Amino acid sequence: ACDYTCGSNCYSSSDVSTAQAAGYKLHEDGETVGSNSYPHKYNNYEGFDFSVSSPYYEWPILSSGDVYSGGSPGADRVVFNENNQLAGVITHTGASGNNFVECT
Numbered sequence: 137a138c139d140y141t142c143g144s145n146c147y148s149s150s151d152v153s154t155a156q157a158a159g160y161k162l163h164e165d166g167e168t169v170g171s172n173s174y175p176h177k178y179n180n181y182e183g184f185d186f187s188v189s190s191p192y193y194e195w196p197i198l199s200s201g202d203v204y205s206g207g208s209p210g211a212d213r214v215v216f217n218e219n220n221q222l223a224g225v226i227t228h229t230g231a232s233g234n235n236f237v238e239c240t
């Protein structure tokens with residue numbers, strides 16, 4: 137069973153903490169990867185009710201199981217805060233345009 141289901145992509149807790157740890161490290165060191173400069177601030181335009189406080193940062197999580205290193209980011213993202221607390225896992229899949237919906 138999936139801990140997080142983003143469209144047709146299946147993720148376990150370990151997939152999420154692994155992706156999150158990589159994004160937080162880059163955030164700490166003030167470095168980015170890719171053309172969209174990840175990790176970057178997640179403004180929460182959609183207004184999700186995250187249990188942890190802002191600011192939020194997004195980092196792509198890949199269905200391949202690999203840690204994002206620069207190519208296409210896919211549609212899924214892990215959202216973490218300043219204290220490296222997981223806010224949630226989101227996706228562009230099933231959302232119009234460049235909007236997001238939470239992964240179930």
Ligand SMILES: Nc1nc2c(ncn2[C@@H]2O[C@H](CO)[C@@H](O)[C@H]2OP(=O)(O)O)c(=O)[nH]1
Pocket residue numbers: 172177178179180181182194234235236
């Ligand atoms: N939909 C959405 N995009 C955001 C938000 N915060 C930052 N973004 C970024 O704002 C632009 C318009 O959506 C995109 O560059 C998107 O990039 P990502 O694809 O990297 O999320 C947010 O809260 N919602």
Ligand SMILES: [Ca+2]
Pocket residue numbers: 146147148151201
């Ligand atoms: Ca996996």
